[PDB]
Poly [ADP-ribose] polymerase 1
Amino acid sequence: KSKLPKPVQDLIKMIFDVESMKKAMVEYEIDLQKMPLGKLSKRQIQAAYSILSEVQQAVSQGSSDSQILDLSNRFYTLIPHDFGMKKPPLLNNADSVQAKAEMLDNLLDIEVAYSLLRGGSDDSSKDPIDVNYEKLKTDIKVVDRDSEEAEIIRKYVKNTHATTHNAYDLEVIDIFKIEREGECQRYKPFKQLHNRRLLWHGSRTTNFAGILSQGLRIAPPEAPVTGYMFGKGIYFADMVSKSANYCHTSQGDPIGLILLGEVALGNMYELKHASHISKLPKGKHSVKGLGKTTPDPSANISLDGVDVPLGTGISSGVNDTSLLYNEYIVYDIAQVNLKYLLKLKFNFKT
Ligand SMILES: CCc1cc2ncc(CN3CCN(c4ccc(C(=O)NC)nc4)CC3)cc2[nH]c1=O
């Protein structure tokens, strides 16, 4: 029987749950009889991204519905969807391509989780919770509720829930301090960069075995750059609720997981609207999508030399922006050092 703290054991059980992975695939309208969890592979996902790229080239060039049909059908051949004996919906627009690119990004983390469960050894004398914990190659410690770091984190949660995200409220259940093996070494060139910020990154519970094992990653070269607002990078928010929406929790599944990462932003490339960029302009280290609302800059505090933007939301003074709240994007995976993982209870008001 595991000697791991009970919150850590509950975390491992949550993230390695196979029925949750199947549920996530059904939510995507994936046909599990044709493409079960076990048959998902990086080469099939990468091929589907390439087809999505072809569909997008065809839509941006103003092709007809009759022209696009063959391209759209190719995507469904690679990733079989649950439509029985009916014609699947046509992928003939930017929105349809973006939704599919987002689904494939998730499949990449689901594939990692399942490959970890299937690729090791079987020993009945060991607690499977300890076996699965070791597969993450991440030290996970419970942060003491009465500590200085816990007070800072709870204040960040309490102060940055947007009024426009008021259909639910958040309750912090557990705060974990995380250290992925090799991440500190990888982060070393960026450890003293200016503008290092502690930012949020939400994801579905089914992504976390992938995130803890492999870290936050960028969609592969096959992925269409136009399927993401600021291109292919790692996206973060300074408002807890903006990132909590990416957990995709519901009344039927109200427990989510959210990360706090130290992000080396350096010289920010400030943008108000979509820019499907491949690379950053010379001298820039990140993109800052300018929101209408920002946490109050005078309330910014420091936690182990990193800026924590935990002030309540105020007007940024930015006009004519596509964004209600800020977002930060890095285009090199080495610019992120994951620090904390929070288990949240979503209390739905609807
Ligand atoms: C503005 C705040 C914000 C934005 C946000 N945007 C997207 C996502 C979804 N997430 C993107 C990365 N994704 C990949 C998985 C594997 C690979 C891989 O294996 N690549 C090689 N790549 C990509 C998994 C799905 C979550 C988000 N959370 C937030 O808080």
The pocket of A1H63 is lined by residues 105-106, 108-109, 200-203, 207, 217-220, 235-237, 242-243, 246, 327 (CB under 6 Å). The first strand starts at residue 138 and ends at 142. The CA atoms of residues 280 and 314 lie 29 Å apart.
